[PDB]
Amino acid sequence: GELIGILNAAKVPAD
Amino acid sequence: ESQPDPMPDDLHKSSEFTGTMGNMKYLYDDHYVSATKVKSVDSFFKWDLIYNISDKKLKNYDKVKTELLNEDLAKKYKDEVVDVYGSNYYVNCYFSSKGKTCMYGGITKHEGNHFDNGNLQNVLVRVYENKRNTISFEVQTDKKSVTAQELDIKARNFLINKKNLYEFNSSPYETGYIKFIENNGNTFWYDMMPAPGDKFDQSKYLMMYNDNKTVDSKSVKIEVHLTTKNG
Amino acid sequence: GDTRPRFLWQLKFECHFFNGTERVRLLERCIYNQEESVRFDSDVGEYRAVTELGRPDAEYWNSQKDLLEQRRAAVDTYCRHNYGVGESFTVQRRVEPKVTVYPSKTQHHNLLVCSVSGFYPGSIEVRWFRNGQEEKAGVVSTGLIQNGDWTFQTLVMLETVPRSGEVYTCQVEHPSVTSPLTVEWRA
Amino acid sequence: EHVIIQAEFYLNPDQSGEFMFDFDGDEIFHVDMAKKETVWRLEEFGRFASFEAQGALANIAVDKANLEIMTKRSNYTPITNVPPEVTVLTNSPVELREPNVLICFIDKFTPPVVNVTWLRNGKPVTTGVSETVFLPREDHLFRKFHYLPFLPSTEDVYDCRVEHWGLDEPLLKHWEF
C-alpha cells in the first residue's frame, strides 16, 4: 500500500 | 530430523530478480569480517554483540555488531574469548555503542578450536550444475568447529572467481543452494540467490546466518547445486 | 534479584488534526524518565526546553537552520502526508455497535442496562427515553472503554420505577449508521 | 481532533526499544526490532499501507545514544517505578458457552517492563492468548493489553496476574461469571 512517512530522530549534543 | 532438500519451487530464481546482482556478489567477493581472540565490548539489543574489530584492508570500520538468533545465544558468547568470521553489510546497519559495520552469527569459541601449527583443515566442496558434478575443490579453515557461514562464504568467493557465480547485473545460473552434510547424516542448505523483486536486501538475506550454526571441519561435506535456466 | 536502576528515554512526534487536514499542529517531544524535557511545537516554530534538563538540546537544535526548516515543513511533508495515506483505513474505519438491553443483576426500582459494544470509532452517543422523552436523571454510564483492538464498548444504566405499559428506549447514534439504533424495554 | 503519534522509546539497562505508530489511541503498527519488519495491529492495515521498518532501526539507535547522554547529565537520576492499574473485562456481554474474550488492561505504569500471566483456576493459560506492545499515554506512562479467548462457564475462575517493579507483590485481578 501507500507509504507512511517517518520523522528522523534528532541527535542531542555530545558530552 | 535434517532439513528437506529443496524442490525447484523452493528456490529463488535469478530470472525473477530485477535488481543488481552485484549487490549479492558484493557480500561474497573477497568480502568478510575476521578477528582472532577478541571479546564483545558492548551490545545494542539483547541478542547482539559488539566487537572492536578494525578494517585491516581499507580502514572502513573499527566497530562490528553481529546479530544472533536470540538472547541466550548472545548471553553465551558475551564474555567469552572468541573468533569471528562472517559477511558484513553497511546498508541499514545501525547501533549506538557505549566507522561501523554489521553481520550475523559468525562467532566461535577460540579456546582449543585451532590446530597446533597454523595448520588449516580442508573441506570438500562438490559443485553440481544441472544435477551433474562439474568441478570439485576444497576450502580451508583454521577452526576445528567452524560456522557454516565461514565455509559458505569461502565457497562462494571461489565460485564467483572461477564460475562467475554472481556478476554485476545477473548470474549465469538460475537457481543455486549450498548444502551441508554433517558426519552424523544431518543436512541443511542455504539459498544462494536473492529473493524475487527489484531490490536486494543484504541485511535481510544475511540474517540467515542468525543461528550461528557450526560444524566439524574435519568431517563436514559441502555440495553446491546450481542450475542454468534452460539446461 | 534485579534491583538495577532504570533509565528511560521517549521520543514522540504528535500530529494533531482538526477539521481534516485544514489545521495541523506538529508536536515533537522528548521525555527522560517521566519528565518531558524538550519539545518542538509547530505553532511555536522552534524547540523550547520544558525543564532545565532540556536546555542544552533546545539550544543545540535551534542552531541548526536545516533542522528547523525541515521541522517547520513537517506539518505538510509528514503530518498531512501521513493523514492522506492512512485516512482511508483510520479516519473512515467503521464498525457498527452491537446493542442489547437487559435488566442488571443488581436491583423497589429496576435497573436497566444498555450494552453497546464492538464499535469504531469511539465517538458515540447513547441516551435513554421513557415513552419517547429523554431521561436526564437516573442515568449512569461506565464511560467509553477502548479495547486496544480498534474497538470500543460501554454500558449505560437507567434506574427506573417501572409501571406496566411503559416503554424505555435506549438510543444510540454512531458514525457507522445514518439513523439511530433503538432497543426497547417493555415494562 | 484526530491524532497520529509516532512513539518510540529505549530502556536501560534492559535495552528494550520500541517503535510504533498510534491513531487516536489505537495502534497502527510497531516494528519488530529483531526481524526488522513491520507488524500491523490489524492484518488489513498491511494491505492498505506500507512502511520502511529499517527506518525505525535508525531512530532507535539515535534514541539509545541520546538516552546515554541524558542519563549521564541528569547524574544518573533513575526512573521512579509507577505501578499499573489493572482491570479485567470481557469484550462483550457474557453468555454461558457463547465464545467471548477476556481483556486485561494494564494501564498508567512505567517503566515499560511487565510480566503478565492469565490463570484459569490457579493454573496458567497459554492457548489462544495474545498481547499488545507498550502503548503511549499523554502523561508519558504506558498502557498495554493482554487477551484470553474463552468459553464462559459457572465453574471457572480467572486471574490476570501482573508483576511490575512498582508492585511489592504480584497483583491478581479476579474474574468469574
Side-chain angles (χ1 to χ4, degrees), chain A, chain B residues 2-231, chain C, chain D:
Chain A
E2 3 195 1
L3 200 75
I4 288 296
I6 212 183
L7 226 48
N8 297 310
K11 304 188 57 59
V12 316
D15 291 324
Chain B
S2 58
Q3 164 177 41
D5 276 5
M7 285 297 275
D9 293 56
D10 297 349
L11 307 166
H12 286 166
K13 288 73 178 191
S14 62
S15 74
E16 302 184 343
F17 176 62
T18 298
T20 302
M21 193 53 72
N23 299 317
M24 167 63 92
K25 179 182 176 177
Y26 176 72
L27 302 180
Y28 301 92
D29 191 359
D30 192 30
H31 180 79
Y32 65 84
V33 164
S34 180
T36 307
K37 263 179 68 182
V38 288
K39 185 195 290 62
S40 83
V41 301
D42 196 357
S43 171
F44 189 62
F45 278 133
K46 285 183 171 185
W47 61 85
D48 72 61
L49 295 176
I50 296 166
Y51 294 83
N52 281 311
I53 310 165
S54 287
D55 177 357
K56 334 296 178 183
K57 305 168 188 173
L58 302 307
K59 309 272 70 179
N60 274 186
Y61 63 84
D62 67 4
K63 286 280 198 176
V64 168
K65 174 192 70 171
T66 187
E67 285 176 72
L68 299 170
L69 178 65
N70 54 57
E71 210 193 316
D72 291 331
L73 201 57
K75 278 187 180 183
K76 180 197 298 180
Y77 302 88
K78 182 173 184 296
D79 301 303
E80 286 225 279
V81 179
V82 306
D83 303 304
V84 175
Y85 198 105
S87 185
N88 62 129
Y89 64 99
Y90 300 96
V91 177
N92 287 153
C93 170
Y94 309 120
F95 68 86
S96 199
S97 188
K98 288 294 166 49
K100 296 133 72 171
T101 197
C102 296
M103 70 188 271
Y104 299 82
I107 303 164
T108 59
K109 180 180 179 185
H110 171 285
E111 198 62 348
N113 190 52
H114 291 274
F115 303 98
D116 52 55
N117 259 176
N119 263 57
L120 298 182
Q121 170 68 195
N122 300 310
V123 177
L124 177 64
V125 175
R126 283 186 298 172
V127 181
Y128 300 72
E129 287 175 63
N130 296 309
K131 298 181 176 183
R132 300 186 69 71
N133 181 22
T134 55
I135 77 165
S136 298
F137 65 108
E138 302 173 306
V139 300
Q140 317 185 75
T141 175
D142 59 320
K143 313 179 185 54
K144 297 185 179 177
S145 189
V146 63
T147 62
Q149 186 175 352
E150 173 172 346
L151 296 184
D152 187 0
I153 296 165
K154 282 164 174 178
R156 298 195 210 181
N157 178 61
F158 183 82
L159 299 178
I160 283 167
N161 289 302
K162 301 302 159 53
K163 285 288 191 181
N164 296 310
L165 173 55
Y166 305 120
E167 287 186 297
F168 174 74
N169 49 312
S170 202
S171 154
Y173 306 95
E174 173 75 326
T175 66
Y177 62 89
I178 174 167
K179 176 184 185 173
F180 283 76
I181 306 173
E182 287 183 283
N183 73 350
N184 56 31
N186 177 68
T187 80
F188 60 94
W189 53 274
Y190 300 135
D191 193 319
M192 303 162 77
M193 296 296 177
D198 55 33
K199 241 242 189 175
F200 176 53
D201 186 325
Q202 301 174 316
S203 178
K204 177 52 48 58
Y205 176 80
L206 291 165
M207 193 180 285
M208 67 183 191
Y209 295 135
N210 223 187
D211 56 23
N212 205 62
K213 220 300 180 188
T214 49
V215 301
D216 173 45
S217 60
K218 274 206 183 309
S219 64
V220 69
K221 285 172 183 272
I222 287 66
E223 277 167 38
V224 176
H225 290 55
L226 311 175
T227 66
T228 48
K229 203 178 188 306
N230 43 46
Chain C
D2 184 0
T3 65
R4 302 126 88 208
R6 310 290 145 158
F7 306 106
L8 184 63
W9 174 258
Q10 285 181 265
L11 170 63
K12 295 171 168 174
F13 295 96
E14 301 174 7
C15 286
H16 296 247
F17 304 95
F18 324 64
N19 192 311
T21 71
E22 221 177 73
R23 45 145 54 52
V24 178
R25 176 189 172 206
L26 162 61
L27 186 68
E28 160 176 358
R29 44 213 313 222
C30 292
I31 306 309
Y32 181 45
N33 284 307
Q34 224 200 301
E35 134 182 45
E36 181 161 344
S37 57
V38 216
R39 68 161 45 183
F40 170 88
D41 197 321
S42 66
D43 289 327
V44 170
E46 56 172 44
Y47 287 94
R48 287 298 175 67
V50 184
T51 61
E52 292 305 296
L53 214 215
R55 267 189 170 175
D57 310 313
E59 261 142 296
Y60 174 51
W61 289 331
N62 282 331
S63 78
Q64 296 169 65
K65 281 50 266 294
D66 62 333
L67 177 60
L68 261 33
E69 242 203 20
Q70 90 110 314
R71 239 47 160 185
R72 283 159 183 165
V75 299
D76 291 340
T77 62
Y78 173 59
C79 293
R80 297 175 200 279
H81 166 76
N82 289 339
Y83 184 102
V85 173
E87 157 182 51
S88 61
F89 60 103
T90 56
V91 174
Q92 283 154 52
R93 154 170 258 256
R94 274 152 178 54
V95 186
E96 193 184 336
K98 180 242 232 58
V99 190
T100 180
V101 165
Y102 58 86
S104 172
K105 310 105 289 186
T106 295
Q107 286 59 61
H108 194 268
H109 300 53
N110 185 197
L111 214 203
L112 296 182
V113 174
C114 188
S115 183
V116 186
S117 57
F119 60 103
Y120 190 94
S123 60
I124 191 291
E125 197 150 49
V126 319
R127 312 193 197 72
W128 271 111
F129 295 71
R130 168 183 149 296
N131 299 303
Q133 54 194 305
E134 174 104 48
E135 273 283 61
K136 294 298 185 61
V139 193
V140 171
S141 176
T142 186
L144 187 61
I145 309 300
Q146 181 162 44
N147 301 315
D149 71 336
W150 288 78
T151 274
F152 294 72
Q153 63 170 301
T154 183
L155 293 183
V156 176
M157 287 73 267
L158 169 57
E159 189 60 293
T160 65
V161 200
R163 293 174 63 278
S164 170
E166 296 180 305
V167 183
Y168 294 102
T169 300
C170 176
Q171 169 176 284
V172 182
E173 305 202 68
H174 179 274
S176 62
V177 296
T178 58
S179 51
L181 289 169
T182 61
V183 174
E184 329 183 315
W185 172 259
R186 304 303 189 87
Chain D
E1 260 195 55
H2 257 313
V3 184
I4 289 57
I5 306 166
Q6 176 189 319
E8 24 184 300
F9 75 71
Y10 193 102
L11 184 66
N12 263 336
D14 315 61
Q15 50 192 177
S16 296
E18 176 176 312
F19 181 109
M20 62 107 259
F21 260 67
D22 175 300
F23 179 77
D24 293 345
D26 287 309
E27 169 187 346
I28 298 167
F29 75 83
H30 67 260
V31 171
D32 176 322
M33 242 81 91
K35 296 186 179 182
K36 309 182 183 187
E37 45 184 57
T38 302
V39 356
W40 309 92
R41 188 59 183 71
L42 300 184
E43 191 188 309
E44 28 182 296
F45 296 162
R47 291 186 267 111
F48 312 141
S50 78
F51 182 76
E52 288 317 309
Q54 299 284 9
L57 285 296
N59 275 19
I60 279 302
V62 167
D63 293 339
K64 179 167 184 168
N66 284 347
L67 172 58
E68 314 273 31
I69 303 304
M70 287 300 287
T71 299
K72 179 174 186 179
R73 99 180 170 216
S74 73
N75 272 89
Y76 308 85
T77 296
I79 191 28
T80 295
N81 296 307
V82 178
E85 234 181 65
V86 189
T87 307
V88 184
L89 298 176
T90 59
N91 67 42
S92 72
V94 63
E95 318 281 359
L96 291 164
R97 300 188 192 181
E98 295 289 61
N100 202 307
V101 181
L102 277 178
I103 302 164
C104 179
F105 306 77
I106 309 305
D107 202 1
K108 315 197 184 78
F109 69 94
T110 197
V113 177
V114 72
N115 183 66
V116 178
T117 291
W118 285 109
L119 292 179
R120 178 181 248 133
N121 304 305
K123 275 165 280 185
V125 187
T126 290
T127 61
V129 302
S130 63
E131 70 187 74
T132 64
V133 293
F134 302 89
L135 311 179
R137 285 175 50 87
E138 171 55 40
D139 50 32
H140 304 136
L141 301 170
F142 304 81
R143 10 147 58 172
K144 187 154 151 65
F145 297 77
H146 274 70
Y147 310 94
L148 168 62
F150 80 117
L151 195 67
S153 84
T154 55
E155 307 145 355
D156 301 321
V157 288
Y158 298 89
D159 286 292
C160 179
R161 179 177 183 292
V162 181
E163 288 184 290
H164 180 277
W165 294 315
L167 297 170
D168 295 346
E169 264 179 356
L171 172 51
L172 278 73
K173 297 308 291 193
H174 218 294
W175 189 92
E176 59 184 4
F177 182 70

